[PDB]
Design a protein around this ligand. Sequence first.
Ligand code: NU4
Ligand code: NU4
Ligand code: NU4
Ligand code: NU4
Ligand code: CL
Ligand code: CL
Ligand code: CL
Lengths: 695, 697
Amino acid sequence: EGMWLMQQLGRKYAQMKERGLKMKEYDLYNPNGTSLKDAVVLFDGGCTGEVVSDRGLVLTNHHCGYDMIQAHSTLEHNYLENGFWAMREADELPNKDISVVFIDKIEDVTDYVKKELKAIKDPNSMDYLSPKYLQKLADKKAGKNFSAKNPGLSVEIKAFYGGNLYLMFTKKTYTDVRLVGAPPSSIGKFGADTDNWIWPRHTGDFSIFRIYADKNGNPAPYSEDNVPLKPKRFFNISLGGVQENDYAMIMGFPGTTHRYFTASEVDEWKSIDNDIRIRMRDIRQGVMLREMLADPQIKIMYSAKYAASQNAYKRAIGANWAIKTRGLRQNKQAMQDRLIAWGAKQGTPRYEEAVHEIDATVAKRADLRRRYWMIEEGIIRGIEFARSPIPTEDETKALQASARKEAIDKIRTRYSKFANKDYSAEVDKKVAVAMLTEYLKEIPYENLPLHLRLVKDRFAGDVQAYVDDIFARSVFGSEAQFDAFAAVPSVEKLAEDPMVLFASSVFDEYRKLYNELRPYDDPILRAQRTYIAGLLEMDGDQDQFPDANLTLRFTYGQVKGYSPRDNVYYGHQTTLDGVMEKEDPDNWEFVVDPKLKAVYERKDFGRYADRSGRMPVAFCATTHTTGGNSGSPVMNANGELIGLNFDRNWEGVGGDIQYLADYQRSIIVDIRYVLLVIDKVGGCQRLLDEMNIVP
Amino acid sequence: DEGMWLMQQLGRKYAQMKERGLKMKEYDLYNPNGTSLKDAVVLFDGGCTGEVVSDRGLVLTNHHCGYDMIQAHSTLEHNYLENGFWAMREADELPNKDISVVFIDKIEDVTDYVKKELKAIKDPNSMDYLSPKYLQKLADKKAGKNFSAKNPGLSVEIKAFYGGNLYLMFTKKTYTDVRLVGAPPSSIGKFGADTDNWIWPRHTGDFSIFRIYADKNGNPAPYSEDNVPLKPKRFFNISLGGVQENDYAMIMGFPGTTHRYFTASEVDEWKSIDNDIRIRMRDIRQGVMLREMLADPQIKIMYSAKYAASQNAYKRAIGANWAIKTRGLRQNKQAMQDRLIAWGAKQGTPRYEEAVHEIDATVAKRADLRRRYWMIEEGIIRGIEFARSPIPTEDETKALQDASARKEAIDKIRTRYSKFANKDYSAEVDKKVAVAMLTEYLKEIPYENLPLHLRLVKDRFAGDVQAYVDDIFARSVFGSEAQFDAFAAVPSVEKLAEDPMVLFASSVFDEYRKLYNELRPYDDPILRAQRTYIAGLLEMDGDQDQFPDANLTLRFTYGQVKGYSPRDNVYYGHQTTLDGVMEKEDPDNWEFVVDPKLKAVYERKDFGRYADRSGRMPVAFCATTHTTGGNSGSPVMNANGELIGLNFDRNWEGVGGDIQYLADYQRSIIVDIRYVLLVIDKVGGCQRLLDEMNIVP
Ligand SMILES: Cc1occc1C(=O)Nc1ccncc1
Ligand SMILES: Cc1occc1C(=O)Nc1ccncc1
Ligand SMILES: Cc1occc1C(=O)Nc1ccncc1
Ligand SMILES: Cc1occc1C(=O)Nc1ccncc1
Ligand SMILES: [Cl-]
Ligand SMILES: [Cl-]
Ligand SMILES: [Cl-]
């Protein structure tokens, strides 16, 4: 049910042993020694990874290493489509802008931070959550020049439980992290966007990297003189596999949760955030899909844009399903009524006042929040010409010296990036007509961005005519129209350009709404500090975990399937047979790698198949994970690596607010399948030899 | 494989059924010389099964079987299709026109008689052995002089089985006064609508209730206000004990057709011609239709039924091709015929190998013709609506060529035009469908094999299909109402003779009939060789583990209440519940609307004695019984012969079961009788129906 701080291992250890944990507490997390925690990394700021060899080999997801695979791919050596297998350490590819972060030490600095905060003065100060204020406290505690005295190390203080607990982390960051191996995208991204958030799942979502360091194993930027890191801890790989009900645990960096939402915040998340995102993206997606199905060239240009819109659309559908069917609002209401009754009994009304402040703030900002989501989903992300070029102040106060040619060249560059190889003005006009029709139905005239008032005033309510006029008269409406402008440019032409005026008006309204809504966050945040302090004082810090905040957490559970609906069961494990069932040669998402299809036909599974002779692919577990946990190590009762977390089923996306024991699962790639791919698909035996594979 | 057994075969199957869980005495299920449970089973309205469930002739069948009778009695004031219908007294039950229930009074083996009569052979290749006319002459000869007049309500019929190796005479008792008694609302009766067609898990309460009325002596009589409910020989007791996983289940009913004795070459033909062409052509038709329905809400209303009608056999063909591809249907037919050929060689009789060779050679010879026939039937006859536009009859052309006979012919042509261009017809949707269908048809069918008018696409329109279709509508008398009216004011045979739409329709129907006539002779050598083929299979492996193909005659099948795994890591259990209906509820989707009385019953858990041991309300279950079209409404029995449900569908994964039963995938989809009784009770409030049934604990 939770995402526990490493400090909370002591408090959860007995229950973990009762559930099947076999390892000693300090072998998993030792606060003043080496433990399994030292083999877990924050991979490139937004993923988890794990060290799996005494020479710094790192496993993470294929979707986590995707950008590094794509950046090294060319027409001659397309690593993204065929995979990549460095047959020697010297062939491993360096990556620019990459990092791996180790959590060297974790310290409770609550008393220190709370004492420092007493010197504020303004009781409503937000310094208690400010990264700048907390960094000043971290630097004061670690010492003026800590990083010079301790190379590779840095300190950081974060707030937890809404400001009721503070932890200081001593981090060790390595920036020379090289690409070692990756399966073809047909394996790494098998279901592609069709199987996103889906269980059963058949995706071998893994990639392999290596941490390089100086001669003393200290962090160093890329240098041909760097040598592999010899880590103090790395995971052993288990080949014992998994069975239904086996104990499983994860360590990783979950990004965000909202476990302490009030019932009013759940209602707002549903009726504003989710319903608007669902409604607006369903309109955008429908027009886009119609156009992609009618023209194969439009399908190529808009596939990525369509997939990018669908991902959070599906998440919002899954989240709304939990709100509707799993009683999220009711359980938050019961949580807050229980605190209010307890507070009345203690003679302390501050908890009821805090819940009241959150409800009143949520109620006050509703119309503004609705207008913000409507414009952001409807126009800012909904219509491509909303992000068309807007002449800067430096460009207009240059057009009206011969820096006129310099202003036009910069405007041309931005026009070329807007009307790129994947942009269709015809597809965009059709999407805009549908999006704006919905937006104008929902947003009243007095709340419209200035230019959109012209639909009623100038175009007699004709949305199609308004959009047609924007393109017919705009300098960014076509290449010929831009070139005619570029030959005789004037600031007067730009000032009255219908596309410039649209883009400017909608961005102006978007920024105005953001600025008016931003002050409402602070009273909610301050009242949450009181609210969570009351919940902790009442029911204790053991059942209620602190919200995720991109810090190292552990979660535990079992390898277990679930029933998604009446008379349907999805088991705990998928097999290579399921990959073959899904094969579709005329669907790029479900193409099966020929080497993998051959391995399946010959049953060349070696030591990786289960006792039945079937080849495992993926499994699911009752662990509590969220975005940030991609690539997390999945451990046995013995702490051995049994898989990598790579996704979570859509039925459990509401788990960020309330864990759903009967539906929510972590989707994990079986480590036996990872080794099978390295071995029979990549032929990279050296990686198998450097890992410590236990029977 | 797990057959549709003749009633005659119950004796030789009985021991295995007892070992599988059957508890009843053999002759209580079927006795050729006296009353048995077989007497409570009826052929409901020619194409469904039904069952007698009371001593006053009450009949249960599917909602989709009684659909036309419910719809015919529905009005704007009393919409029984939408809200259901519950007659609170026998006098309120609604009579139905053109309805029948058929009882199988007696079944007799007449093989020796038919085979002796057939020996008077004037031609060894005669097809009289399969002719309904010839067999009726033999049935009338055996039954006697004016049997139907001496035994009113009874009729005699002989059917061939095992390709002409076995003949049975059936004495049927037909009742035509069958009245509507009760029906749940469509929201329960057809809950999944076409979305859940062929789907398991299933949550549809697919039942309707009728009553057989008869004269004072219980003899068949047409509708009369003097008719009294029938007192039957036998009726089913209703069980409330429910079902559990692995329970024995059996069905009696009228499966229509199977092809269990196809050669491997007939499986290849069914896949590569019949199914692939139907799939490819309907996918094109459906895609254009769906795009037009999604863009215009009025087109969606006009084309929903046409779209659903095209999709039903499209889905069946997809399911059947999945079995051919993944379940080894072709290979198992090949093994069946190689085993017979090896045995025949050992017996010194080459006639079985010669028979299989004749079927293969005939299948190979007709391939191009069969491909051209399916291409035109799926592509144009079914695919393009203006293919069924009006064609002036010979008598209409003669009438239009001096007299008032001219205006009579024009009125007749107008009537047919009005039926073609009706409230659901869109010429714009039809032109778009035709352009796509014809583009595919012209790519597949060479110029020399095209219907005469379609040659104009290359000759006159320079390969432009859109221009050809545009010209048909712009210049045709049936292209629009104003164009028809201009013709009707000044009509001439000359205008009709050169009309592009008339010429198109005439040419495609001419080609369709020519292909049918050229292909028809190929059926006879296959049929005669199948008589030899099946005789060999029966002589070799006996009439014990190979059932005769279904032919709309009474059969029994047995199995277990059991779910299945449709794919890797997925399991569908044996039973669905009312909870699953609630999970599927969607008020803005007519297909998944939930009746308020039913939703309230679920909320209050007002399930009474009908609920399972865990307090869950059962809805439907699935079984390993072998059923097909014709089995809709069939009684599902317990090990004791008590009614536990009604068969109403089969999952798409098992549609290949008509050729080869699929033990691990094929299931009969059954409405739980506890759910039927719950709906009658808590939704209909028709307590009198519960009281007349014999409900056992
Ligand atoms: C009803 C159903 O049956 C199978 C899948 C679904 C479904 O809703 N899928 C889904 C929902 C949200 N995001 C992604 C996928
Ligand atoms: C068919 C079904 O519907 C709801 C649940 C199930 C089911 O099979 N459950 C199950 C199977 C295996 N392990 C654990 C539980
Ligand atoms: C692969 C699959 O998963 C769920 C359903 C299907 C499917 O193909 N359904 C279907 C096929 C043929 N006729 C009817 C329905
Ligand atoms: C076969 C299968 O694949 C994935 C899950 C299952 C499963 O649960 N099987 C099962 C459940 C209940 N009774 C019998 C079998
Ligand atoms: Cl380290
Ligand atoms: Cl012979
Ligand atoms: Cl099977």
